[PDB]
Structure formats: C-alpha cells, structure tokens
Ligand binder design. Structure first.
Ligand SMILES: NC(=O)C1=CN([C@@H]2O[C@H](COP(=O)(O)OP(=O)(O)OC[C@H]3O[C@@H](n4cnc5c(N)ncnc54)[C@H](OP(=O)(O)O)[C@@H]3O)[C@@H](O)[C@H]2O)C=CC1
Ligand SMILES: NC(=O)C1=CN([C@@H]2O[C@H](COP(=O)(O)OP(=O)(O)OC[C@H]3O[C@@H](n4cnc5c(N)ncnc54)[C@H](OP(=O)(O)O)[C@@H]3O)[C@@H](O)[C@H]2O)C=CC1
Ligand SMILES: O=C(CC[C@@H](c1ccccc1)P(=O)(O)O)N(O)CCCc1ccccc1
Ligand SMILES: O=C(CC[C@@H](c1ccccc1)P(=O)(O)O)N(O)CCCc1ccccc1
Ligand SMILES: [Ca+2]
Ligand SMILES: [Ca+2]
Ligand SMILES: [Ca+2]
Ligand SMILES: [Mn+2]
Ligand SMILES: [Mn+2]
Lengths: 411, 411
C-alpha cells in the first residue's frame, strides 16, 4: 500500500525537508514512492534528486533548461522517466492516476496555480504555501466543494499542530476549508503560537531604525528571506491568522496569537468544554510534512525523542500590537473579508521586498499596507469560479501596483 | 437522548464534582439523567442530594443508617425512589437497564467491587478509583474481554489527559485495558505529569523530618487525606504509572514521570513518529469527569478559558528517586507483575495511614512497602474469575497484615 507522492518545489526548503523525511522513513520500511518532482529552474539539483528517487515524472518550469535536463538524465542507467516542462507538464502530473498526494512547496503567488490544479484532479494537497489560502481562501472553498474528493492537508507548522490535535472521527465528517469545520470538531478557540522573530524585545525607537540585515540574523529557523522578513514584522503570524480562519472556520475573535520563544508547543486547540490540546516537538518541518502524507495514520520515525526535562522551561506572552502593527492589519483585513486578505497579501509582498532591499523602514511596511487596504473597495464576489479567479488576479495585481505607487509618491 | 448516569461515592470529592458539572450541563437541556446515588454512610448529605436530583435509586452501604435514610427521604413530597442498601443494593443498581454510565468515586480497594459489577453488567465505567486498576488490572482486563460492551473510561486527571490526546478514530477501534491498545493508537511513550507534592524541593535531611501535618498543609488541590499523603510521597504517581500501563497497554520503560509544578499540562503522549500531543487546563476534575461521560463527544461548559499568557511559564524536571523511593517501588512491582501491584497497593494503604497518624517517619513508608514486596512470593494466577477475585482479596489482606506486622515489630 505505498504512498504515491509528488513533490512540487522539490529543491526548496519545504521540498528538501519533504524528501529528507521520506528518505529517512523509507530506510525503516518502504512506504513512499516519489512519483514526480517539479521545480522552476534548479536543473542540476533536480538531476541529483532524480538520480536518488528515480521518479516516474520529472518537470521543470523554465523551458530554457528543459533540453539540459533531458541530457543530464541520460546519464542515469536503466531510467526512462517522463520528462515534462511548464504549466503543461504540471497539469499532466496532476492528472496522473498514479499520484495520490502532492506536496506544495512552491512559494509566493505562483503556488496558488498548482494548488488549484491539484485540487481539480481530486488529490490530497499537502499545502505549505499559506499565501495561496490568504489570497484565494473563498475561491479554494468553492473549488473544494466542486472537487469533493480533493483535500487540503495543512503543512504550515502551527496549522499542522492544530490539525494533529483533532479527533479524526470528526475530521472525516468534514475537511479543511469547509464551513462548519470548527463546529463539527467542537473547536472553541485557537492559540496560534509564534517564535516572535528577532525583534521581539526591541523598543519602538529601536524598531524605527532596524534593517533587513538585522531581520535576517540566524532566527530559530533558517528559511528564505521573504518568510524571514515576515517573521520579523510578525506579518507571518498575521497571514497565519487568516490561514487559521480559512482552514478551520474559526472566527477571528477566537484566534489568539501567543509568543512562545522556545518553539516547542506549536499551537493549541481549545474545545467547547474548555479542554485544551496542543502539539509539541522540537522545531522541525519534517513532522508537519510527514503527518500531511500519512494522515489519518502515523508511521515510525527515527527522530530524536523530545526531552521535556532537558527543555525545562516553556514561556508564553502576548505580542505587542504597537510594536507589531502588521498583526492588527491582518486581523482587520480578515474581519472585513471580501478580497481584503488578497489585498493584504499583495501589498505585503511589495512592502516586504522594499524593506528587504533597504528602500523603506520597518514602520513603513505597515504604513504602506494600511494605505493600500484603505484604498480598496469591496467587490461583488463572482459566483463563476473562472471569473472569481480573474478577480483575485486583478485585485492582487492592483494591490501590488498601489503599494508601489504609495512608496514612489512618498519617496 | 439523555445520558443515564449513576454516581457511586456521590458525597465525596469526585462525586460532588460530578454532580456539580452535571448540574451545570442540565441547566437548559436534559443532557444527563441522574438515575442513582450511592454512598457509605453520609445519610444526611445523600438526603440533600436526593432532594435536588431526585434519582430513581438511592443506596447506602452501611445498613445501620438505612433506616435514617428512609425516614429523611419521606420528607420529600411526590418522590418515590427505590431505596437500597449494601452490596445487594449496589448490584441491583448495576443491573438496571435504566443506567448506561457509572462514575466510580469510591475510594481505596473497596471501589473494585462496584467496578467489577458494573463491568459484568456491560456498563460504561467512568473510573476515578485508581487503586482498583493497580490491585486488579489483569483481572479487569479479563473481565473486559468477557463483557464486550463494558468500557472503562479514565477519570484520573493524567489518564483522562492521555485519553484526550489520542485520536478517537483509533480509540473507537479498541478500548482501555485491551491488549494492543498502544499499537492501535500508535503510542510510543507517555509523559506522566505530576505536581511533585509539597516536599518536592526538600533536601534529604529535611525530608527525613517531614510529618503528615506538613503534607496536609494546603496543596495545589484540596483533596482528602489518603491521596494527599500519596501525592507527598509520590506513591500516587507510582500507582498512576501502573494505572497507565494497564489502561493503555504501555510498557513500563515507556512511561516517564515528569514533575510539572504549575499543573497546567496534565500529561502528554509521544506517538511513533515522535510527535507529542498534550492536554492542558487549570487543575479541575470537572473536565475529566465530564469527558468520561460525553466521550467520544464534547459538550459546552462555562469554565473559565485558559489564559496561557497569564500562566506565562511552564516547567518540567525529573523526580529524584532517592527522595521519592515510592516511585521506584511502584515500577519494580509493576515490572514484576503477578500480584506484586496488589501487594504494593495494600502495603501502601497501611503505611500511608501510619504516617498520617504520626506513627512512622517518611522513609519508613517506603521501607515498609519494600519489605512487604520482598516478602511476597509469586502465585499462580487463578484461571477463573471467581477464584481470581478471591485470590486478590486474600493477597490484599495478607499484605495489609504483613505491613502492620513489620510496623509492630520495629517498635
Ligand atoms: N520554509 C519553511 O520552513 C516554511 C515555509 N512555508 C511556506 O512554504 C512555501 C514554500 O516555501 P520554501 O520551501 O520556503 O520556498 P523555497 O523558495 O525554498 O522553494 C520554492 C520551491 O518552488 C520551486 N518553484 C518556484 N516556482 C516554481 C514554478 N513556477 N513551478 C514549479 N516549481 C516552482 C523552486 O524551484 P527552484 O529551486 O528551481 O527555484 C523551489 O523548489 C512558502 O509559501 C512559505 O510561506 C510555511 C511554513 C514554513
Ligand atoms: N479527589 C480527587 O481529585 C481525585 C481522586 N481520585 C480517586 O478517586 C477515588 C475517590 O476519591 P475521592 O472522591 O477523593 O474520595 P472521598 O473520600 O472524598 O469520597 C469517597 C466516596 O466514596 C464513598 N464510599 C466509601 N466507601 C463506600 C462504599 N463501601 N460504598 C459506597 N460508597 C462508598 C464515600 O461515602 P461517604 O460520604 O458515605 O463516606 C464518598 O461518597 C479515589 O480512589 C482516588 O484515588 C483520583 C484522582 C483525583
Ligand atoms: O511559519 C513558520 C516560520 C515562521 C514562524 C516560526 C515559528 C517557529 C519557529 C521559528 C519561526 P513565526 O516567527 O512567524 O512564529 N513556521 O511554521 C516554522 C517552521 C519551522 C517549524 C517550527 C516549529 C515546528 C515545526 C516546524
Ligand atoms: O491524582 C491527582 C492528585 C495528585 C496529583 C496532583 C496533580 C495535579 C495537581 C495536584 C495534585 P500528584 O501530586 O500525584 O501529581 N490528580 O489527578 C489531580 C486531581 C486535580 C486535577 C489536576 C489537574 C487536572 C485536573 C484535576
Ligand atoms: Ca441507625
Ligand atoms: Ca483526542
Ligand atoms: Ca517501546
Ligand atoms: Mn508557520
Ligand atoms: Mn491523578
């Protein structure tokens, strides 16, 4: 009964942690068949992975390196894969009857596209890309009601933790992103844990002058610059608030951000009786990824057991909204609903990059996002799925342009 | 539609907490029907409960206050309960078709008798009385394999926590005490949390001098004297290690006692992937009691929500077995199996009472228990239930007598 898995974004942080835990688990017993690997342009790395996992399908997005990949894969003896390119190749892979589960480790806005096609092919979608949910949550809800056999299984660590705290006898009566998920699971409230990022103990005046260099300074987890910046501003956590609302149908007044600097308790679920269940481990994306691929079961690993006595102390505190104004903006956009989350995500893409490139200061990030949100006006939501997607693209693009206009006007 | 419940030991700590949470849950809808109340001799307090809850059945164990009870209840107009006494009364209630679930909040080895009869009648037994499981675990396993519709649902707080941490999709395919429970639930290891008791930070020289007055000075939970003294010696945790083994089919080497002095995390389960799930709340037996009666569902309470940021800090350390030798004894008895747990429990009943009454010192408790364990010789386990029960009572009585003899000899 092998688990037939595609890795989308196989050469990045999520995709490499995915293949790492697949490789480790397979040494204990052969449970995973890596059926497909897909990247943008890392042709050499993709060759290396093909050599180890020998998947039925290989796909690279950039046409320019397609021929190169074909050439490299000739070196592999007794190995005749289907080698594909672009959106076309992504669609072929998602339509393959032999693939059951697709890890979406593709970053940014691009991630939404393969997520959509994985859903349209009624797959299990192990979704790490939170921006897809924040930008397109209602659309994805509509799409999951057309494609009844598709499921999104959360991989973002906090959302994986929440999901792991549930009773699957209740989860199996519903699915993530469905209205009423929280009611069917008897969920009352969520505690959404955060590392707090590097700036958690800075004063307002220190924040005024922090730089992206300071933000990119060996945090509790090593990741790409974009999510690292978001962790520093706590807009990551704001996006994760919206992600929680969409995935689990929890009201915004019932999502509490809590700063947990040790990063052992990964989030907690308060049920209607007031009992609280939490998921814990060392910080490591292997467990969230693995659970997304084994759910509703678990399998043996050789990971180091948690030593709670050694950890010794766990601490919890409320984040300061004045120091981390991005969090308030995310709640405000979420509560407004409509396409406000799309606008939040898009404007933050721009503001994050401005700050990364030393073009704006820390409080300018929230200033720009706030000004874009204030310029948007709620749009009638199309009932037509294709039209709705068009609206999300139009609004995303508008909001990025607006954020850049605001920066250029001031500058 | 209402859950039909009996409360055994209705006037004590567990029973009163059970009626408190039932009263709250019954404010608007008829969620529970309190069908029966049973006590030992608290006739006046039973009468008062009867006036409120008007159960079909009343039972009092001590037949010397049966007449007092009949006389008091006549004062309640238009109420015609079945009024019973002793063992016969207990058995009639257990055999009633009108009763689905029984809360066992009777203390000491005496609680085993009603536990056995409730199982024999295929009831759901919400079991707080841990001494029953320690004294008679293997026998209760045998009885639960006969009486296929009976279940034990744990009420002891740590064991309720463990049970809540599990995935009900898996729990529903087995039941507590059943062989292979841990395999079916993908359990690797248990972190069994403890308050540590009042003596947790004493030096060895300080601990030599402790008295029961010191042990009974206002702990983190107000409870009666026996469990309060067991908390102080950590024999309560020792008993709970054995209870964990039997309820969840977890090997002794996979049960780790952790002292968690804030008493917010109530225990944790490590699964085979090394993910850990924990259950948390303020100390309050209403959640474990309610859960036992609603499982596999949860219902709404009006308990104060957990304020994790206010709690702020959680700590964990390993207990010192030199300071708390009772823990070691319990592991030793458990690992030996046979009737060694019966002897542990019985000898502890004596030693606890001697210390309570200022007859022996703290380290004498563990000395006495150790000596009785070293005295006992393994017996062939009776193959039939009636004989097995007689053997348990014989061995329990022998071990109490042995502990008393050791005490009599030493002074
Ligand atoms: N890293 C982490 O621990 C966490 C990340 N996340 C989320 O996970 C997502 C993925 O992040 P991460 O692994 O950090 O990202 P990376 O930038 O490390 O990896 C992105 C991957 O996607 C590939 N890719 C990019 N565009 C395309 C495309 N058009 N078609 C196919 N493949 C594509 C890249 O290929 P190439 O190598 O060719 O560039 C790379 O393999 C993000 O949305 C992030 O928010 C969530 C929680 C934590
Ligand atoms: N209190 C707590 O928070 C916790 C308790 N436990 C366990 O729960 C059990 C009960 O503890 P707790 O409620 O503290 O004890 P209590 O001493 O407060 O209450 C005992 C109850 O049992 C009744 N009882 C005693 N003997 C008999 C009998 N022969 N027939 C019928 N009823 C009888 C008493 O009746 P009467 O009033 O007439 O004396 C009373 O109603 C113990 O095994 C303990 O280990 C487990 C976890 C925590
Ligand atoms: O979204 C992220 C990255 C950012 C957040 C974070 C949280 C915990 C540690 C470091 C960083 P934030 O700072 O926004 O709270 N993540 O899910 C953590 C991935 C690493 C991980 C951590 C715990 C459990 C398993 C995997
Ligand atoms: O067995 C007991 C009593 C003794 C142990 C304890 C644990 C937590 C606080 C104080 C005392 P020990 O000292 O042996 O760890 N109990 O289950 C707690 C009952 C009260 C309670 C606590 C947490 C959750 C719900 C109810
Ligand atoms: Ca009398
Ligand atoms: Ca559960
Ligand atoms: Ca083991
Ligand atoms: Mn996250
Ligand atoms: Mn307990």
């Amino acid at each position: 009964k092998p688990i037939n898995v595609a890795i989308f974004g196989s050469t990045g942080s999520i995709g490499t942690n995915a293949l790492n835990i697949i490789r480790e688990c397979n040494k204990i017993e052969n449970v995973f068949n890596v059926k497909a690997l897909y990247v943008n342009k890392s042709v050499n790395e993709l060759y290396e992975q093909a050599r180890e996992f020998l998947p039925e399908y290989l796909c690279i997005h950039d046409k320019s390196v397609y021929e190169e990949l074909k050439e490299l894969v000739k070196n592999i003896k007794d190995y005749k894969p289907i080698i594909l390119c672009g959106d076309e190749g992504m669609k072929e892979i998602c339509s393959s009857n032999s693939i059951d589960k697709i890890v979406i480790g593709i970053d940014s806005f691009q991630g939404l596209y393969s997520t959509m096609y994985a859903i349209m092919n009624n797959k299990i979608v192990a979704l790490a890309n939170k921006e897809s949910i924040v930008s397109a949550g209602f659309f994805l809800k509509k799409l999951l009601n057309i494609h009844k056999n598709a499921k999104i299984i959360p991989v973002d660590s906090e959302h994986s933790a929440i999901f792991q705290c549930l009773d699957n006898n209740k989860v199996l009566k519903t699915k993530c992103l469905q209205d009423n998920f929280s009611k069917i699971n008897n969920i009352n409230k969520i505690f959404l844990c955060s590392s707090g990022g590097p700036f958690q103990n800075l004063t307002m005046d220190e924040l005024k002058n922090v730089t992206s260099e300071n933000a990119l300074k060996h945090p509790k987890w090593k990741m790409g610059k974009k999510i690292t910046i978001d962790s520093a501003t706590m807009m990551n956590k704001g996006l994760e608030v919206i992600e929680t609302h969409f995935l689990f149908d929890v009201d915004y007044n019932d999502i509490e951000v809590i700063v947990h600097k040790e990063c052992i308790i990964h989030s907690c679920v308060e049920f209607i009786d007031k009992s609280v269940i939490s998921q814990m481990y060392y910080p490591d994306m292997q467990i969230p990824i693995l659970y997304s691929l084994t759910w509703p079961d678990r399998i043996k690993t050789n990971l180091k057991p948690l030593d709670l006595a050694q950890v010794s102390t766990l601490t919890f505190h409320k984040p300061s909204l004045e120091h981390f104004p991005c969090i308030k903006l995310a709640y405000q956009a979420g509560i407004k609903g409509n396409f406000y989350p799309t606008v939040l995500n898009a404007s933050n893409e721009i503001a994050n990059n401005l700050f990364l490139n030393n073009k704006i200061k820390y409080f300018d990030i929230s200033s720009i996002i706030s000004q874009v949100l204030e310029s948007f006006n709620s749009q009638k939501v199309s009932e037509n799925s294709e039209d709705l997607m068009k609206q999300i693209l139009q609004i995303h693009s508008w909001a990025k342009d607006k954020a850049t206009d605001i920066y250029n006007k001031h500058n």
